[PDB]
Each structure stands twice: as structure tokens, then as C-alpha cells.
Amino acid sequence: SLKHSVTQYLEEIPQQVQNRLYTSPATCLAIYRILPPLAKFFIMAMVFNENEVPLLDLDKWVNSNGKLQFQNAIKSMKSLHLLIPNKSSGTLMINLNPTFKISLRNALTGGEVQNSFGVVVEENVVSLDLLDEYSANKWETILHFMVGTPLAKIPSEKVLNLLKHSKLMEEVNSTGEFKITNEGFQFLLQEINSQLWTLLLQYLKMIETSKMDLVDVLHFIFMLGALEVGKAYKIDALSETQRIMLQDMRDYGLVFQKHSNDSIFYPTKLALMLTSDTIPDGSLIVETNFKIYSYSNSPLQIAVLSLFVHLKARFVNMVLGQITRESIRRALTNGITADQIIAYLETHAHPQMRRLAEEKLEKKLELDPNCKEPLQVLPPTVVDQIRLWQLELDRVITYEGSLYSDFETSQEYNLLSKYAQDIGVLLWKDDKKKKFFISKEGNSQVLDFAKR
Amino acid sequence: TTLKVSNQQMLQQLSLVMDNLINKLDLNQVVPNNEVSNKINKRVITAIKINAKQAKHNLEVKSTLP
Amino acid sequence: NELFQDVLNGDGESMSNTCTAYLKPVLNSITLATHKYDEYFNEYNN
Amino acid sequence: LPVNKINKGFTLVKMGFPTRIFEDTPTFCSCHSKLVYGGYFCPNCHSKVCS
Amino acid sequence: ESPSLLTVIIEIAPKLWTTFDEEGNEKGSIIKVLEALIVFLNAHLAFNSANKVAVIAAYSQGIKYLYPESTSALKASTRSDLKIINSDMYRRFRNVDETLVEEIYKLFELEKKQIEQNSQRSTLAGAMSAGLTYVNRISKESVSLKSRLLVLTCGSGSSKDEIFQYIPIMNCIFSATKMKCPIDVVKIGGSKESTFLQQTTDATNGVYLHVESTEGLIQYLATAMFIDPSLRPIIVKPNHGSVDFRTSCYLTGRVVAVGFICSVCLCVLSIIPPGNKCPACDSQFDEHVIAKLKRKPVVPR
Ligand SMILES: [Zn+2]
Ligand SMILES: [Zn+2]
Ligand SMILES: [Zn+2]
């Protein structure tokens, strides 16, 4: 989700790169909040004493109710390299990471920070009038390029090849359009904090050149998480990697500058949104006649409903659509599974649907208490129709590969079939018909097995 | 059932607090000197060992008696 | 007391301590009651 | 409920304040005759209670 | 996992801390405990981004909030940027610590203005009630949020146990039990046994901590007081010396054995009151039941 992805990226980082990361207080403070609460409690227990603590003491701290959670915390301790285990006098004692402990203590008590949290220049503008709608406009134009609607403005080529290298946004040049994948609709489905984290981690996996450094991008991302909106910050404490980072995050919408090559930058609400989270707009009404009555005024929700609903009208408050067959066919040719569509409908349903689902489930439990049913917030007829339209695309499935037959002896056929089954490339074998099929990726192995 | 302090010592102590507060409130002095921290940790571990031995275990419970 | 011997020749002190500890609080209760009776008896005698 | 002025049952009640015992060996309670790990020693007769 | 509120009910009294300075070898112990409190609050704010912090200082004339500031001072800020903590730290820590030290400055100046009056009335109980009201406001304003209380009291071997704090603090306990808000107690002083606060932290599922030296207090606070309410059931508590949950008699003041109360005002009497009248509710008692109680039990000859 959100913590699991950044944690996994942190274990993907090597140990020496982690030790180089842990120098500044900002990244240690940000990493400390990713830990489980018992892990955070143990970190704060061990930060203020300069002697190693045995593992038996930390085992004694945890009650018998959540022992496995303690192990999970220890697993996180064994994953981010926050502890050094030491075998001394037959005992397995735990020492805190010295760079991490020094950095976190400098973050808490104050002292040397080497300007890792920025400095205010006391020239600022109000966030709502400029920065809020700047970050909003950047996010809506990039996510409207995400949904594929026509636009009079397109972002820079850097976020374009960000999407080209990504698993989402498959590309064709002979046609002139950019295709959304299943991962694209998954990206639209989740909340904007997880959206920022997926985009930033993929931008992390892109970069390998000497133009910018991995410790610099990590420190700057966690520092942008650590800053506060509404107050500006100045530039020379950042590296050249971090000036071009200011350029790239201004292109993405994380940070505001009035003009290029300026020394004063304004963090946006997305930077504060990066660390943690904090009738609805986009709530829609769906009936048995496949009608869509959506309370949406922003172009984003209308455009993302246009992916799988044939929209018919638009008001300032209403958007009128219909769940037709061809719209769902377009969605499935866009790779969008029906489960994600059903998820998008149920998380954006009207509260009237939710309440009526509770009276319907109350009537069900007073009707048939012997079985329990899920809270069907949507009627099952439209869900069944959506799943049938899902099934009717993949009624017929073609596997590409090669078929081998024409064996005079059954022993050779059985040997070839079991050789294909051992390497996991066979899809069918039949001794009565004396034919077996193998996949495209396994054609060469069977070929040079038969040749040799 | 099973110390008197005058106002002038009171006021001079408060003034000492004032001049110790105004000049430099250095937080890093809270860090112990690797010995009193060890003693405090030892006392806390002994107390929590006592409390965990008492609260390890608390329909009747099962017993080894037939 | 007979229970305090009934386990004593039964399992051989790997088990008598458990029974003794199980029956301790009622034993101190009746001991305190008998002691209070005896000391009021000696008080009214004197 | 508020009591009336005519009621004159203003009576002393003799009670004790028990002490919460902490033992690692379960013992027979005096109220239910079952194994309980904890208990409250009565200040008058040194018997233990559950609740 | 779940964000929390930490409210510190710090009891700052110049007489109590002066007696602690006289008893201890060191001087200016309020600076050390304030430093430990500031680092502990920064640690709690580092524990989670959505965590919140409040401080109530209880002085000899009453109570005063320290964070968040008095809202008129927030609206006026006029410019009062005193350089007490350096400006290069993390900003969310910096705002809280600067507000706290500015309120310490204002409170010490206000009490230095009112040093001529010596008060025999301690305001710890009212400060705890104010902290519990703050816990209510934060709990019902934002929808849920776990909460905790911290009490940094000082006895210094001079202030003994006080009867008038029995009724309020007890009520606070039940309100804490209503909101599942633990009340955590740190006592700095020579009085090893403080009955009422121990009963409070035992009945509210908190932790008691009696220390004798103000130095190294951040080790204590980050070791044992750092039990966030999200992991209270999975952490065994280091509170040693379990409290007996007894009470004190009315006419003698001693700790009570098997004893007598009236059925009118529930005051505890270790002995039968003279005149057959309850000392608190002034109710007349009949001769029959007190003659039954004063009667000796029987024994045969
Ligand atoms: Zn009894
Ligand atoms: Zn019972
Ligand atoms: Zn009375």
C-alpha cells in the first residue's frame, strides 16, 4: 500500500547506502515514522542510552498478547539495519545504529542539522490563493493526461518518459495515442498520497546516471515531506542534483517557483501530503437501468468516469451517464478488470445506497439469520452484467507457441511430453492423438534438446 | 498520620531560573553520561521483570493436578 | 494434616508442595480463627 | 433515590478493605472454590475473594 | 497506527522546587525537568505526525495552559520571538517548544509578581480536571483519537499527603476510566509513597514512577512513560510497589483496617465516633447497633 512500498524500497537499498542515508536528521525523522509503533517505542527506548541493550530485555518488555507483533517489529529491525546484533559472553545483545541514533537525537534535542530542514526567508504568499491551486492545476493536468482526455496543455517530456518507462502508459507511435494499463486504473483508484509514493518510487527506480545521486534524491524527498506549507525556502544548501530536482518537482507539482532559475521555492500541500494522510464529490448513483447520476463538478471525476461510462450530459452538479455495453468493452480493451470497476463504484457510492444496504441486510438477517451476506451497496444485477461483459471478452483465449506430433513410438512422445512438463512449458499432451503443445518461450529449449 | 523556606531564597532561586532560562536553553544536556543511564535502565528492567513475573498469568485455570 | 500426608507417601514431594500451596489460604484462615478463639478464651480466663 | 426525613436508619456499617495479593501459584478461592491466580485477602479472616 | 494526544500536567511551584533544590546537591532542577519535558514532547511529536500535545502548569495561584498558547496571544502575534531555542531545528518541534518556553517565561514573571502571597492550597487536582476536559474536547472534536495524561508532580520531602485532594482526583480517575485515558505519574521527591497518585495510576491503567534525581529524566520518560495508547495492552507496565487501594480515617487519620462508615455520607471511621454522631454528616445514631458493635464476641468458659 503506502508504508509497505516505501519499506520494501528501503530494504532494496544496500546497507552502506542506508548508512550514508542516515546522516541527516530529516530522513531519519521521516523513516522513524514508517516503523511499527512497537518498533518506534523500542527506538525511543534505545536512543537515549549509550550502551547496548540485550534482546532478552526487549523480549521482557512485550506482553504475551502481542509477542508475534514484537517479532514483526524485530523483523523490521532486522530489515532496515537499525540494530547491530552482537554475540558477547554467550548473549545476543542489541546496539542501536550509531549514525541513526546520533542523527535522531540531533533531530529531537536540536543542534547541528547542517540545514537539513531548510530555512525561511520571510517572504511568503498565502497558500490558498497561489500554491493550493498551483499544485491542484499541476496534478489535474498530469492526471488528465493520465486519463487520456484531450487537453490544450500537455506537461514536459520528462514526465512523458517517466510514464513511458513505467509499467503503465503503454505506447504506440503508428496510431498517435497513449494506452492506459490495468496498473493505470489501479493508480487512479488509490488515494493521492499513495499516488505520490508510487510516482516517486518509480522515478527513483528510473534514475541511475551521474546527473543526480540516490542519497540526494532520498534526502530531498524526505525533506519535502518534512517541510511546512505556506513558508518559502532558499536554495544554496541544496545540491545541483537538488536544483534540477526542484525543476523536476516543479514540473510534477510538488513545489512552486514563480520563475525558472529563482532562489526561493514554495512547498505545496502535496509535499505535506507526502508523509501521511491529513456528500463527497464524485459520489454517483447507479440504478438497475444502468444509469449514472454523479455529483461531480471537477473535470477529473468526469474524465475518469468517461473511461467506462458513456456519459450523456453534464450540469454544474450533475453528470448524466449510462453503463452501456460498448463503454465496458472500451474499458476491458484498456485492460481495466471488472473487479477494479466494482471497487471504484462501491467506494464512490452514494450514502443512500449504504443506508439502504443496511436496511436490506437487516431484512436479510431477520429473514434468513442462518447465513451472513456482505453489504451489497450496489444492486447485484448491474454487478452481474458488468462481470458478464468482463467474461465475454475472454471467452476465447489463444496461446501462441508450437505443436509437436508425428511420433512413430509412444515412448519418445512420452519422454518429450514429460521433458516439456518438467520445464513448465507444456499446455496440452495427448497420447491417443499423439500431440503436445509448448509455449513460445520454451520452444528453443525443446528444440536444442531434440537437436542434441 | 502513621521544611520552612523564606521568600528571599525563593525569589533568588526564581531569578537563577530566569537567568538560566534566558541565556541558552541547551537541550542536549539531557543526555546521561553512560552510567546513570545504565543504572536507570537496570532499575527499569528489574521492575518490569517483577511485573512480568507477576502478570505472566492471571472458568478456572488448568492445573497439573489429576 | 492427613491430606498433608496423603500426598506425602503418594507422589514423594514432587506433588505435595502443589497441594500444600493450593490449600494454604484456607489453612491460614482456620489457623487465625482458632488462634483468635484461643486468645479470647485465655483473655476471659484471666 | 432521595430518602425522606422521617427515616432514622442512620446506621454504621462494619466493613473491611481487602488487599490485592500477588502470587504465582493458584489457590482455592473462598467464594467459588476454584483456581484463581489473583485475589483479595480479606482483612478480617485472611480468606481470599474473586470479585 | 492510531494518532494520540499527550497532555502533561506539570506541577511547577517555587516553594516545592526550592525545597527540592535545598534537599538535592544540585541547583536549578526545574531547568533540568523542563529540558527533559521538552525533549520528551519532541519525542512524542516524532512518534506520529498526527499526534497532538498539551501542557498545563499548576502554580500556587491556580492553573495555566502552556501549549497551545492563550488564543488572544496567538491572535495578537505583535512580535515576541524570544531566542530561547535555536531556529534551525524541525519546525513542528520548534513551534511547540517556543510556545512552551514563552509560557514558562510569562508564568514565572506572573508568579514573581505574586510572590508575596503564600498559598496553602495545591492546584494539581484542578489541573488534572482541566487536562481531562481538554482530552474530552480533542476526543469529540476530531472523529477517533486515543489519549494519555502525564503528571510531573514534586513533593520534595516537604508537602505530605493532603486530604482535600482525595475527592477531586478520585473523580478524575473515573472520568479517565470513562474515556480510556491513562493517567501517568512521575513524582520527583523524597516521599517514596504517595498514596493518591498511585491509586490513580493503578486504577487508570497507567504507570507510576518515583525518582529521586532530576538528572537523566529523559531516559526515564522515553523508557517507561513512552507507552503510547496504541500499544498499551501489548506492553507490560514497569509500575513496582502495587498500591493497596485503602483510605484514611476521618477522626484519627491513620490508614484503616476493618472499619466503620455511616450510611449517609460514606466517611470512613476507624473507631466509633464520640457522642454517637457522625463527624461529617452530623447525623444522630441509634444506640442499638453501636451497642451491638461495641459488644464483645462470645467464647465459652
Ligand atoms: Zn472475611
Ligand atoms: Zn469468585
Ligand atoms: Zn456521615
Side-chain angles (χ1 to χ4, degrees), chain A, chain B, chain C, chain D, chain E residues 1-77 79-301:
Chain A
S1 301
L2 188 153
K3 301 299 192 304
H4 187 273
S5 58
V6 294
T7 316
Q8 277 293 327
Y9 185 77
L10 281 175
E11 292 104 13
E12 284 284 333
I13 295 163
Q15 182 170 9
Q16 61 153 40
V17 192
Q18 284 184 355
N19 292 338
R20 291 191 65 244
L21 172 63
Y22 289 162
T23 57
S24 54
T27 175
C28 295
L29 190 66
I31 277 177
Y32 168 67
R33 314 199 214 192
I34 320 293
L35 289 163
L38 184 47
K40 294 191 283 187
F41 171 63
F42 283 146
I43 283 296
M44 198 65 43
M46 294 182 286
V47 61
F48 285 118
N49 45 354
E50 283 289 332
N51 51 349
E52 49 187 4
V53 179
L55 191 141
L56 272 300
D57 293 358
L58 304 185
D59 201 15
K60 284 297 182 181
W61 270 89
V62 181
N63 207 336
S64 59
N65 206 311
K67 291 293 295 296
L68 60 87
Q69 295 192 10
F70 160 72
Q71 291 282 342
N72 297 334
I74 289 296
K75 187 169 74 70
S76 188
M77 295 296 172
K78 227 159 191 180
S79 293
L80 300 182
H81 295 148
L82 286 180
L83 54 77
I84 295 92
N86 191 274
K87 176 60 164 49
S88 290
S89 74
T91 53
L92 186 56
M93 294 177 71
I94 291 173
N95 185 25
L96 198 42
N97 183 274
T99 313
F100 182 77
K101 180 178 62 179
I102 283 300
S103 179
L104 191 45
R105 190 189 311 173
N106 288 328
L108 285 187
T109 64
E112 81 295 18
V113 286
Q114 308 107 349
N115 206 355
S116 66
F117 299 101
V119 61
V120 63
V121 289
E122 212 63 35
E123 58 182 1
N124 44 307
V125 299
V126 62
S127 61
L128 184 57
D129 190 68
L130 190 51
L131 318 177
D132 199 357
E133 97 277 353
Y134 181 76
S135 65
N137 273 41
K138 284 299 178 182
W139 201 236
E140 303 275 37
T141 190
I142 190 54
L143 202 63
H144 282 121
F145 177 74
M146 210 55 257
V147 301
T149 179
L151 286 176
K153 181 61 178 60
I154 47 180
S156 67
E157 190 276 331
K158 300 196 67 42
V159 65
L160 302 191
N161 55 43
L162 171 44
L163 293 181
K164 303 296 185 291
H165 182 254
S166 77
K167 293 179 179 179
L168 72 165
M169 280 315 208
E170 39 190 356
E171 201 269 335
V172 60
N173 264 310
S174 61
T175 310
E177 53 93 20
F178 294 150
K179 305 185 298 301
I180 309 164
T181 66
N182 193 7
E183 306 291 330
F185 199 81
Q186 187 67 215
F187 173 55
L188 276 296
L189 197 42
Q190 320 181 69
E191 192 65 18
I192 62 170
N193 47 5
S194 55
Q195 286 186 353
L196 291 203
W197 279 118
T198 57
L199 200 65
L200 286 187
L201 270 69
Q202 204 283 359
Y203 175 73
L204 287 165
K205 304 163 261 153
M206 281 176 97
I207 187 64
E208 296 300 319
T209 64
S210 65
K211 293 296 187 302
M212 51 175 38
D213 205 3
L214 177 67
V215 295
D216 294 335
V217 64
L218 263 184
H219 296 127
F220 196 81
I221 283 173
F222 285 137
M223 181 253 267
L224 274 188
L227 297 172
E228 50 179 347
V229 65
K231 290 213 188 111
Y233 297 93
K234 63 155 293 300
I235 209 172
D236 61 349
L238 321 174
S239 66
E240 54 96 18
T241 80
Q242 292 188 353
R243 280 83 66 192
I244 57 174
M245 182 45 108
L246 294 174
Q247 301 290 322
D248 296 336
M249 310 304 78
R250 184 165 67 256
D251 291 331
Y252 293 168
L254 293 185
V255 56
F256 181 76
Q257 264 171 4
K258 188 172 182 179
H259 202 262
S260 60
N261 310 330
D262 295 3
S263 55
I264 300 304
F265 64 93
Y266 286 68
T268 61
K269 296 188 65 61
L270 294 174
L272 188 153
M273 187 66 204
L274 184 58
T275 47
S276 61
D277 193 11
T278 311
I279 62 170
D281 200 44
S283 175
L284 73 165
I285 296 170
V286 190
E287 297 300 313
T288 64
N289 60 344
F290 308 96
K291 285 295 185 301
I292 301 299
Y293 294 100
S294 51
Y295 298 82
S296 176
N297 55 331
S298 61
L300 180 61
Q301 294 154 336
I302 313 173
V304 76
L305 275 177
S306 178
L307 267 75
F308 63 93
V309 167
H310 175 270
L311 294 174
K312 300 180 65 178
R314 176 195 176 185
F315 287 161
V316 295
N317 196 2
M318 295 299 102
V319 176
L320 276 296
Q322 187 179 0
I323 308 182
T324 65
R325 202 193 159 268
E326 70 270 18
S327 63
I328 310 299
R329 300 299 310 291
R330 285 188 294 110
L332 276 296
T333 61
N334 286 335
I336 310 176
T337 181
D339 308 335
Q340 281 180 176
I341 302 181
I342 293 168
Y344 184 79
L345 276 296
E346 59 199 289
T347 68
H348 286 59
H350 210 261
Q352 194 191 10
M353 311 205 188
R354 281 75 178 272
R355 59 88 173 173
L356 189 149
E358 284 104 14
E359 292 85 4
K360 191 169 61 179
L361 188 153
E362 282 292 328
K363 294 300 180 300
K364 176 66 178 180
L365 62 86
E366 87 174 18
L367 192 140
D368 198 11
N370 300 271
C371 61
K372 298 301 179 300
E373 302 292 328
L375 193 73
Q376 296 177 354
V377 62
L378 278 74
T381 308
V382 296
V383 176
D384 270 351
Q385 195 66 49
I386 289 302
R387 293 179 182 177
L388 294 174
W389 286 338
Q390 159 86 47
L391 260 53
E392 73 173 5
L393 168 57
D394 53 351
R395 223 161 180 281
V396 59
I397 301 102
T398 71
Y399 298 96
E400 199 269 328
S402 59
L403 178 84
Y404 281 172
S405 65
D406 203 8
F407 296 99
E408 285 85 13
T409 58
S410 180
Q411 289 289 332
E412 178 193 1
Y413 173 78
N414 288 333
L415 195 140
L416 265 296
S417 70
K418 70 172 55 63
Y419 172 75
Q421 189 63 37
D422 280 1
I423 59 183
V425 310
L426 187 140
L427 299 185
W428 181 29
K429 50 164 287 187
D430 196 19
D431 206 15
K432 300 298 295 181
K433 183 62 65 68
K434 212 71 68 179
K435 305 184 178 298
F436 64 91
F437 182 76
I438 52 178
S439 60
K440 176 63 180 59
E441 50 92 20
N443 281 333
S444 300
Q445 309 177 6
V446 183
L447 263 176
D448 65 355
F449 173 72
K451 284 301 180 180
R452 297 168 186 174
Chain B
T1 47
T2 180
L3 190 150
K4 193 64 179 181
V5 171
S6 61
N7 286 329
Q8 63 84 30
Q9 274 179 352
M10 182 146 198
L11 185 59
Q12 68 91 30
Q13 187 262 0
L14 285 170
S15 303
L16 178 61
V17 176
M18 291 315 317
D19 58 62
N20 200 17
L21 193 69
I22 283 297
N23 56 6
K24 178 65 64 179
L25 178 41
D26 44 354
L27 303 187
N28 49 2
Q29 304 291 328
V30 304
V31 183
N33 44 41
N34 209 22
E35 206 273 334
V36 62
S37 68
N38 185 30
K39 186 244 181 180
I40 288 164
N41 282 152
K42 177 181 181 56
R43 168 181 174 178
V44 169
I45 300 299
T46 48
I48 191 167
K49 274 178 180 179
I50 288 176
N51 286 25
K53 201 66 177 181
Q54 286 183 357
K56 184 158 61 66
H57 49 79
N58 52 1
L59 181 59
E60 61 175 357
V61 301
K62 298 184 61 60
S63 179
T64 57
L65 275 73
Chain C
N1 295 333
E2 287 98 11
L3 204 45
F4 276 9
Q5 283 104 28
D6 201 3
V7 60
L8 173 61
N9 53 3
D11 291 348
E13 216 61 37
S14 57
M15 176 74 191
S16 302
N17 63 6
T18 59
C19 172
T20 305
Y22 275 25
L23 279 71
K24 262 281 295 182
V26 65
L27 169 64
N28 313 277
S29 74
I30 48 184
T31 312
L32 180 59
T34 49
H35 183 48
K36 285 178 65 176
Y37 180 84
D38 292 336
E39 65 89 18
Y40 263 50
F41 182 71
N42 298 331
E43 179 184 355
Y44 265 68
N45 285 335
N46 299 329
Chain D
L1 306 183
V3 293
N4 202 314
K5 197 190 301 297
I6 60 176
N7 199 357
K8 308 299 293 178
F10 292 166
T11 306
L12 280 173
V13 183
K14 186 182 179 181
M15 66 182 180
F17 296 90
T19 66
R20 178 172 53 180
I21 203 61
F22 273 141
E23 297 184 299
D24 45 354
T25 304
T27 50
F28 291 163
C29 64
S30 305
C31 67
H32 304 153
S33 302
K34 61 191 300 181
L35 289 201
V36 286
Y37 274 138
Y40 293 94
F41 269 51
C42 170
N44 216 55
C45 63
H46 287 180
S47 54
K48 55 179 305 173
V49 294
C50 289
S51 175
Chain E
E1 189 179 9
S2 53
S4 58
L5 176 62
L6 165 65
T7 302
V8 173
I9 306 307
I10 185 173
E11 152 176 345
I12 66 174
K15 39 184 300 177
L16 294 174
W17 287 117
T18 308
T19 44
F20 184 57
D21 291 331
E22 292 175 357
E23 286 289 332
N25 54 89
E26 81 282 346
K27 302 298 181 300
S29 297
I30 192 66
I31 301 299
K32 295 301 175 300
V33 66
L34 194 62
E35 279 178 339
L37 177 57
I38 278 164
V39 178
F40 173 63
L41 292 190
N42 286 341
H44 176 267
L45 278 169
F47 186 83
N48 193 279
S49 296
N51 265 13
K52 286 186 178 177
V53 65
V55 175
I56 291 172
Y59 54 71
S60 59
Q61 312 323 100
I63 68 175
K64 192 169 187 174
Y65 270 111
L66 306 191
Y67 182 80
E69 51 195 301
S70 180
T71 62
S72 55
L74 295 174
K75 293 179 179 179
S77 64
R79 292 188 296 272
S80 53
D81 195 19
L82 275 74
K83 293 300 184 62
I84 302 186
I85 312 296
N86 43 59
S87 179
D88 64 321
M89 51 175 38
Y90 182 76
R91 284 291 302 178
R92 304 191 42 252
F93 298 159
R94 165 60 146 73
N95 296 332
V96 175
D97 308 318
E98 271 315 324
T99 314
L100 190 136
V101 298
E102 287 174 3
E103 286 314 292
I104 290 296
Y105 182 76
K106 279 186 173 56
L107 198 149
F108 283 166
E109 287 323 280
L110 182 163
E111 190 276 331
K112 180 182 179 181
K113 189 62 65 179
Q114 184 62 255
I115 201 168
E116 59 88 20
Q117 167 68 29
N118 291 120
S119 169
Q120 311 95 0
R121 184 50 172 288
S122 179
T123 58
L124 185 64
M128 272 180 57
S129 305
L132 279 166
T133 54
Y134 192 88
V135 166
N136 190 9
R137 185 181 68 189
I138 294 297
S139 182
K140 66 182 181 180
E141 181 260 358
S142 291
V143 294
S144 59
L145 204 70
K146 305 295 180 180
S147 172
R148 201 169 85 252
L149 272 167
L150 186 71
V151 175
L152 308 184
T153 184
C154 182
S156 73
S158 57
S159 59
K160 291 294 185 179
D161 202 4
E162 300 300 317
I163 306 301
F164 63 90
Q165 286 183 352
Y166 184 23
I167 301 299
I169 295 179
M170 271 305 168
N171 270 305
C172 295
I173 297 169
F174 305 120
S175 59
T177 300
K178 189 50 192 296
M179 281 156 308
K180 205 173 74 175
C181 168
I183 301 186
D184 274 344
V185 179
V186 172
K187 183 179 184 63
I188 297 169
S191 185
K192 177 62 183 60
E193 281 206 60
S194 185
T195 56
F196 291 158
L197 277 296
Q198 273 178 276
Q199 304 166 0
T200 302
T201 183
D202 189 359
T204 57
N205 205 20
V207 287
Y208 189 74
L209 183 63
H210 177 259
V211 304
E212 72 271 14
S213 302
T214 177
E215 56 88 19
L217 193 45
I218 192 65
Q219 184 48 253
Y220 264 115
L221 299 198
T223 309
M225 301 315 79
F226 211 65
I227 309 180
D228 184 89
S230 66
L231 73 164
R232 276 278 172 169
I234 68 179
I235 292 274
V236 65
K237 304 173 300 299
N239 70 349
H240 66 316
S242 175
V243 69
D244 62 358
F245 271 124
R246 291 181 182 269
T247 181
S248 66
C249 167
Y250 204 94
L251 294 174
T252 54
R254 44 181 51 231
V255 64
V256 66
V258 298
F260 322 101
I261 62 170
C262 80
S263 179
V264 183
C265 68
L266 300 167
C267 65
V268 192
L269 318 173
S270 61
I271 50 178
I272 310 297
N276 312 332
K277 192 172 58 181
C278 184
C281 69
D282 266 320
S283 301
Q284 198 273 333
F285 281 51
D286 73 26
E287 201 46 27
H288 187 64
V289 72
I290 58 181
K292 201 267 181 193
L293 270 296
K294 276 284 193 54
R295 173 211 99 181
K296 214 82 162 184
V298 286
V299 62
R301 306 286 81 76

